[PDB]
Amino acid sequence: MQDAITSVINAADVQGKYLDANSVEKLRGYFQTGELRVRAAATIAANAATIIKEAVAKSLLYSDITRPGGNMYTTRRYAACIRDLDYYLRYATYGMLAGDPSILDERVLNGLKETYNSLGVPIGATIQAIQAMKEVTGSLVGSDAGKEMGLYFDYICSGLS
Amino acid sequence: MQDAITSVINAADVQGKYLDANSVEKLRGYFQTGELRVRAAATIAANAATIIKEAVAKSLLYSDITRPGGNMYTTRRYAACIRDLDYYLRYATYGMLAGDPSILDERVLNGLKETYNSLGVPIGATIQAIQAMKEVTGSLVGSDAGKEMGLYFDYICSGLS
Amino acid sequence: MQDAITSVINAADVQGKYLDANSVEKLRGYFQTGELRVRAAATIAANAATIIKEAVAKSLLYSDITRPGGNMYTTRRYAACIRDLDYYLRYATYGMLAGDPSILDERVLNGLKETYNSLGVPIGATIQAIQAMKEVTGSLVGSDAGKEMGLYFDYICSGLS
Amino acid sequence: SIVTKSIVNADAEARYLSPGELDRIKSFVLSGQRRLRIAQTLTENRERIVKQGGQQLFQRRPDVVSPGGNAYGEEMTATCLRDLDYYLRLVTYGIIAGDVTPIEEIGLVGVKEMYSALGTPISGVAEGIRCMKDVACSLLSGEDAAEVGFYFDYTLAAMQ
Amino acid sequence: SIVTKSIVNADAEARYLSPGELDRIKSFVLSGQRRLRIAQTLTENRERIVKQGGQQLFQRRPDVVSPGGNAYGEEMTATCLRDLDYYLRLVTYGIIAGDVTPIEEIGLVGVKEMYSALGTPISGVAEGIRCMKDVACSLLSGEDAAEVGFYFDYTLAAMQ
Amino acid sequence: AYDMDGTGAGSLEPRGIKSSAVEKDSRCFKVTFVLPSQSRLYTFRELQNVYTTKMVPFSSWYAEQQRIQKMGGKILKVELVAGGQMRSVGNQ
Amino acid sequence: QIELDAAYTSLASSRAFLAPFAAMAADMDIRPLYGKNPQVFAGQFLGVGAGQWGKTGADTVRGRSRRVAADIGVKEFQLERVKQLVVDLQRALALEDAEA
Amino acid sequence: MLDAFSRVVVNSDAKAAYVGGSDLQALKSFIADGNKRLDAVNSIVSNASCMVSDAVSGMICENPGLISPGGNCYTNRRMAACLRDGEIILRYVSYALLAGDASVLEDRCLNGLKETYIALGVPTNSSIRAVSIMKAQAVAFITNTATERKMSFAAGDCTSLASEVASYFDRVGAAIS
Amino acid sequence: DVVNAAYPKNIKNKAPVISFDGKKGVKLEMVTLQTFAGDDSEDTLFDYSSGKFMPQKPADMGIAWPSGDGRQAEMKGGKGSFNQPDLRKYGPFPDFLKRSMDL
Amino acid sequence: SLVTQVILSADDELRYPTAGELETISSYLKTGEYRIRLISILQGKEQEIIRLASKKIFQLHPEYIAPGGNASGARQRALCLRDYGWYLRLITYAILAGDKEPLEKIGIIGVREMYNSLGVPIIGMIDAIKCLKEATVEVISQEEEDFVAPYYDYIIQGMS
Amino acid sequence: RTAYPYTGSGYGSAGVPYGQDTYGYKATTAKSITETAAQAGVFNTFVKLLNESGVEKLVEQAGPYTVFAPTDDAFAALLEPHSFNKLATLLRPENNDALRKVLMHHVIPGAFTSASLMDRAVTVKSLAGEPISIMGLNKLVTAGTAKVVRADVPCANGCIIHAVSSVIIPPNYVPVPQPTKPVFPRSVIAEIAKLPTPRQALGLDP
Ligand SMILES: C=CC1=C(C)[C@@H](Cc2[nH]c(/C=C3N=C(/C=C4\NC(=O)[C@H](C)[C@H]4CC)C(C)=C\3CCC(=O)O)c(CCC(=O)O)c2C)NC1=O
Ligand SMILES: C=CC1=C(C)[C@@H](Cc2[nH]c(/C=C3N=C(/C=C4\NC(=O)[C@H](C)[C@H]4CC)C(C)=C\3CCC(=O)O)c(CCC(=O)O)c2C)NC1=O
Ligand SMILES: C=CC1=C(C)[C@@H](Cc2[nH]c(/C=C3N=C(/C=C4\NC(=O)[C@H](C)[C@H]4CC)C(C)=C\3CCC(=O)O)c(CCC(=O)O)c2C)NC1=O
Ligand SMILES: C=CC1=C(C)[C@@H](Cc2[nH]c(/C=C3N=C(/C=C4\NC(=O)[C@H](C)[C@H]4CC)C(C)=C\3CCC(=O)O)c(CCC(=O)O)c2C)NC1=O
Ligand SMILES: CCC1=C(C)/C(=C/C2=NC(=C\c3[nH]c(/C=C4\NC(=O)[C@H](C)[C@H]4CC)c(C)c3CCC(=O)O)/C(CCC(=O)O)=C2C)NC1=O
Ligand SMILES: CCC1=C(C)/C(=C/C2=NC(=C\c3[nH]c(/C=C4\NC(=O)[C@H](C)[C@H]4CC)c(C)c3CCC(=O)O)/C(CCC(=O)O)=C2C)NC1=O
Ligand SMILES: CCC1=C(C)/C(=C/C2=NC(=C\c3[nH]c(/C=C4\NC(=O)[C@H](C)[C@H]4CC)c(C)c3CCC(=O)O)/C(CCC(=O)O)=C2C)NC1=O
Ligand SMILES: CCC1=C(C)/C(=C/C2=NC(=C\c3[nH]c(/C=C4\NC(=O)[C@H](C)[C@H]4CC)c(C)c3CCC(=O)O)/C(CCC(=O)O)=C2C)NC1=O
Ligand SMILES: CCC1=C(C)/C(=C/C2=NC(=C\c3[nH]c(/C=C4\NC(=O)[C@H](C)[C@H]4CC)c(C)c3CCC(=O)O)/C(CCC(=O)O)=C2C)NC1=O
């Protein structure tokens, strides 16, 4: 659980040296985007339910995982999805603010693909839901902010694959 | 954890059909006797301690897993057996009522043979005990009821093997 | 978790025979060294912090695991060492009293080398520390008592290797 | 034994052994010469301690050997004395271990489940061990009879 | 009864009673006329059901009444039949309650602690209830004997 | 003390999990399992990882293994990491 | 047999396990409470009561030596089934012979 | 080459240690039965001319194709070499029983014996039986249970030297397998 | 096929085996001379099993349990009356992960 | 089903089913085919009933049908009858296994969050099921519709 | 930047997750003894002899064992003229008795990896009951007459599997004799004449 400042301090500390010009050079780069990330995390908090409603209706709403036999049939199973998609849109918001994807594999990625295989959850439909959820997130926060929030979505999709 | 009615429904709507007339013959077998299974589960509840006392005396208690060095020597280890044999005679009673062995592997079979290998419990003497316990159970409940209760004993013996 | 008396009773019991002359012959050999082990465990309890302070300063105090980047750099990581070395000097004291190294692999050795590889703890420097800790322990308790306490140190070093 | 559970006591408490624990491991090993003599007396007296043990057991509990009793006939009576040979053996272990830890995990843990599941009256086997105790303490002096009898009555306590 | 534990079941689950629970409270109260007739048969047959109950109990377990048995003499044998009158009474409660809930918290919960603490062979009192069961089911038709006997064997199961 | 005092059916403490563990047992397993909660959709509590691998003692593995299947869990692997086998004395 | 012979070595090992106590209880005074003289109430014990004698009588009388010993009906039954099938299946090949 | 004293030196050089009080109880017990070890080497070298003919001729009555023509004990020069390496191996095992460590066994006897016996075409499985009869004889002489010659001894346990000389022949029989 | 009515019960008699025993007569013999046979067929005429028999386990259903999440194993009846089609289809799915329809 | 509730509910107490529970299985299995005969009546009237359900759910709620509502459009209304088909199919399961779990493990548990993420007003779906129960009374006689009545209003109680 | 980095998170971390993969306590992936060998495809006679002989239950157990399972070329190498004398008699179907000890000599209590045998000679007895000397010198680890081929195979319960080149026979193992004829003395007068009388033992007669 490290942000961009924590990761910069760790690498500069792990060699026992002070924060030289290169370490502060990245820190200044993070502070420049500090204004963009909060507004990105602002609108995502507002439209959390709307984004997840848009992703599932655009990716896996009418596919036969939704129909009987599909992996999302029963109401408990459907309700687990939007609960499950809420974490991906939420933890990706944390990575967008912290500027470092360490929180994702610390709290989301580890034991995740090994868990879906246990339950039999289709990893293929899961990533496309996150990809569609990444597509709507670029709608709200804009282009570059969508590039930032989108940079952690595919990090989840990559490791979850 | 499905009974015969749950499996009929449950397969039934995993594709989502309604129950057609072909598959009410499971139901119509099962709901005929339904009368046979309760009386079978009735007497087994009454003679639970007597059945287990008959199986071990007919079975491994003459062996020598009973003597020193054998797998059943100490009183804690002997007492674990009749505790252990009680589950096989009990869960088999549940399968006999539910008409479906799903409860056995759900709650008995999984991690069972992998557990006895850890403790070093002899699977060979275990199955013999259940086979002898199956033999006395056919004494009480009769022939066809013994065929029903016996049908889940060897299911335990098969998977435990 | 067996001492010398527990191991002697187990082997004599596992064949179902009484304690013959050979079983009591080793038991008499253990009771003869009973006076030596307590005084050995006496002084080790007194100089627990002094022994660990002597071992780390003699083996791995100034090596570059101590410097930045080395495996022992941060104060949390340094403090984990003397916490970690305390168990080796403590559990070795238990083996010296019980006269049987069963407690070590029961409570120390199992999952130990598999744990240090996870954390990335250098097994090479660890054994050297225990070897140096074994060297100072022979200083306090004497020669033969050091031979006894030393006999369980390398047991840890062997299995931890 | 006293050595193994004085360790696992101080093991759980994250500490070493106190003087109270190490002056008794010390006191126990100097006691070890006298313990082997006591166990040596019961070792080759099992012929009398068991056979006279089942002597008073049947005179005090004729039901268990009468027709209908659990130990009826030539067969069960032999096993009727076999268990007494077991429990007499475990007392020799407890005397040398200086504790009922050998008797605890052998013949005591879950003993009521076994004898209830065998149809044996657990109170009857408790009467058998008491009859062995009077024979055992009659074979030793007063200083020893406070020990050899001391382990029997613990077995009597846990067996009811 | 079936009414009180079908409630406390649905009580714990934060819900009302399903059709599966309310079509059985319904099915039980229409069964109530037939239950009182069955309990009415055992009510004024306790003279024969108990006295013939202890009939076969002593013929099958003469140890308990022989000198040394727990129920020895004029005194204990009267109390020897008193307990059978108790358990025969609780079966009349279970038949009217439609469940062994009355028999559960009376005469079954912790019964082994009482009889072990009284010196009574708990297996012996189990033999007594089985002897009462054959007398009870001999007093009723086949449709009823599947019930009145049905509550005895539950008491047999919990009493060992 | 231990869980086999004489308790069985019809006894004062309620009929429950009875383990064959000795006095102060020192055997422990290394188990692995998933255990979906099956109760979050009417409680709406926060979510926790259900795939765990941990060392359970021998004194309470049976209760835990009996309970992991109670709530539909599946046990992927268990081992006896610490302790002996067929050991009369020494499990303490 | 060569698993029936392993059953006979387990019967010989089960008797040597109990022979220090089988002969040690052979000179004890084991007096019952009922069952022998008819002046004492024994109830159904008088003989045995109501179906409890068994199909054989030895299934019927416990002992370690008997109970692994009536085991022999089950391993010797499977050997005699596959042998004595060797009698008369050495007949169709025996007497098929003179014929061709 | 090493001995039982200098095996724990080069083990104590591996941990940059002094040979302190922990390791000297391993060596003072080694000289405690130092009279027992010399009573065990003396049972080997007193029958060593007879054990080598006992063991090579036991190999011949098991595998008689060696003395068959084209074999490996057929030529009489080729027989006299097989009596020689029965006792050179017994010379180096008796040094290993004397020194208490199998370094001189694993640096002089077995140092290239495997590619020797391939390149001479010697059957290796019969070289196991030439070695292992000397294992079953030396554990009979050291325990003094040889069935036709008993030697005089002060009585006591000797079974550690029996398994020590059985460990040195298995070091030979695995290195030439 | 049993087409050998050309070959009776007198097939393998092997009439010309001839043993001279010196310069006298040829001593003709009809010894049958069986092969190094073994007659490789399974499930012969009897059972040859006396006890020791609980070998039967069900087949592996994948990740799920055994005795399957039902739906991937045979229905037949009514589909229903309205039933909108899938139009995504996302692969057919396997052993359904543990929780049946009736979870 | 109902037997599954008894096996489960008896399994968490580590006991066999009691006297009352075995009634609950025995009475349920004796009413077996009548559920089987009833579901075939309803399966032949699924195209019967859902056509009548779309009668009154939309004359009551033209908000959903109108342009702007969720059910506006052909393909939105197309699955609209499909949700009735799955619900009616679920009730045939519930009528057979004589309890609420097939209506609860499917359909009820988490239904609001399903609809709320879909835009379907959850109050409207309650009237849809109430509309569906209103439609089932016409194609069903008075004998058997109160058998199926408690299975409908459980769904309404589940949805609030 | 140091090469041996480490695990953990937060400050004082090297950019590598805990346990190198975010798992502190990793679930194992090995199988047990007999089907780690079944997958290897080389221990075929070994796993089959275990299953027939009943020894396979013993090495099912969770105790830390060090199996020295010989590859079937070792079993195929049992056609020594020498070793066939002492081992061919086990091929008879009644001699399962010695087959268990001879197989039980290959199980060693403890987890002795080859790295743990750095120029060390330690003995131990098997689960058969007789001592065996494991000798690791010059990277040539020996177990009696083993000459180990493959170094180690990690197994389920912390057990190790080494592939050996031959079959270790126990030290005090005598081969079972072949089945023979119970012979009886002809006559009885050829045996009274075979016993020396008391008058012979004192030299009173020839
Ligand atoms: C210092 C280490 C050392 C040894 C271990 C021995 C062993 C040894 N033997 C021979 C040489 C030989 N060794 C054998 C031996 C045997 N063939 C068999 O079938 C038997 C199994 C076995 C006897 C037991 C034979 C038959 C030859 C003769 C080869 C020849 O003369 O061409 C040679 C080659 C020498 C030469 O011929 O020039 C060596 C090195 N000698 C040593 O110097
Ligand atoms: C076909 C040929 C053939 C032989 C010649 C013998 C050879 C022989 N002897 C022994 C076994 C032995 N061999 C000897 C050797 C000797 N005894 C002495 O006292 C002398 C020192 C030396 C003869 C000069 C000894 C001491 C033993 C151990 C047991 C004993 O004899 O006391 C063994 C090993 C055990 C065994 O495999 O049986 C063999 C193969 N056996 C055979 O099968
Ligand atoms: C009792 C059984 C019986 C037999 C097995 C034969 C064996 C046989 N053949 C010949 C005798 C002969 N046998 C052969 C045959 C041959 N010579 C050759 O060089 C050819 C390779 C081979 C032909 C296949 C010939 C050519 C003669 C000599 C001419 C003759 O006597 O016919 C003789 C007489 C030899 C003599 O005069 O001492 C005998 C006994 N005859 C018998 O009565
Ligand atoms: C321990 C390892 C082991 C063996 C090496 C064999 C050895 C062996 N073979 C036979 C017994 C036999 N052996 C042979 C074999 C032969 N006779 C011939 O004339 C041929 C030249 C040769 C075959 C190539 C025959 C023909 C029998 C008679 C029994 C039979 O045919 O089944 C017997 C029984 C002895 C008897 O009853 O007489 C034994 C022990 N069996 C074993 O258990
Ligand atoms: C914070 C990091 C994190 C994640 C991501 C997580 C996931 C997780 N998802 C689960 C289930 C589930 N997840 C789904 C999801 C889906 N079905 C589909 O078809 C889609 C592809 C997908 C939605 C995108 C379903 C249906 C279940 C229920 C499975 C069942 O009942 O068997 C469960 C089981 C327990 C429960 O839901 O209460 C866990 C623990 N846990 C975590 O700690
Ligand atoms: C070391 C601790 C320990 C004990 C105590 C023990 C007991 C034990 N007692 C047994 C039988 C028995 N035990 C008895 C005992 C008695 N009958 C009486 O009347 C008396 C009251 C009482 C003896 C004093 C009888 C009659 C049997 C045979 C029961 C039967 O055949 O059904 C058996 C089954 C046969 C056997 O394997 O021996 C065991 C295992 N095992 C142990 O490991
Ligand atoms: C409603 C549930 C219930 C039960 C069952 C019950 C039992 C009970 N049984 C008792 C005594 C007794 N019970 C017996 C019983 C027997 N002797 C035998 O041989 C037979 C095996 C057995 C009867 C079939 C004897 C002999 C006593 C007197 C014991 C004594 O005086 O020490 C006593 C003490 C005296 C008394 O207050 O009556 C109680 C309380 N109380 C209850 O509330
Ligand atoms: C409900 C499904 C289920 C089963 C079956 C189960 C078994 C199970 N059996 C156990 C032990 C045991 N099981 C036995 C059994 C036997 N010894 C023999 O010789 C016989 C072959 C056999 C009796 C048939 C023994 C002796 C132990 C004690 C082992 C020990 O103390 O090391 C243990 C260890 C903990 C404990 O008993 O408290 C578990 C968890 N757990 C479950 O959840
Ligand atoms: C077995 C239990 C179960 C149900 C019920 C279920 C419902 C369900 N209803 C849906 C949509 C929908 N459902 C409606 C429904 C309605 N409009 C109205 O006016 C009505 C009151 C109501 C129908 C009777 C509409 C309008 C949509 C489309 C919303 C959209 O995507 O824009 C969707 C998205 C995909 C699809 O249509 O298949 C699901 C999964 N899934 C299940 O597993």
From Swiss-Prot, chain H:
This is B-phycoerythrin beta chain. The lineage of its organism: Eukaryota, Rhodophyta, Bangiophyceae, Porphyridiales, Porphyridiaceae. Heteromer of 6 alpha, 6 beta and one gamma chain. The gene is cpeB. Phycourobilin binds at C50, C61. GO terms for cellular component: chloroplast thylakoid membrane; phycobilisome. GO terms for biological process: photosynthesis. (2R,3E)-phycoerythrobilin 1 binds at C82. Contains two covalently linked phycoerythrobilin chromophores and one covalently linked phycourobilin chromophore. Coiled coil: none annotated. It is a peripheral membrane protein. It comes from Porphyridium purpureum (Red alga). Its main location: plastid.
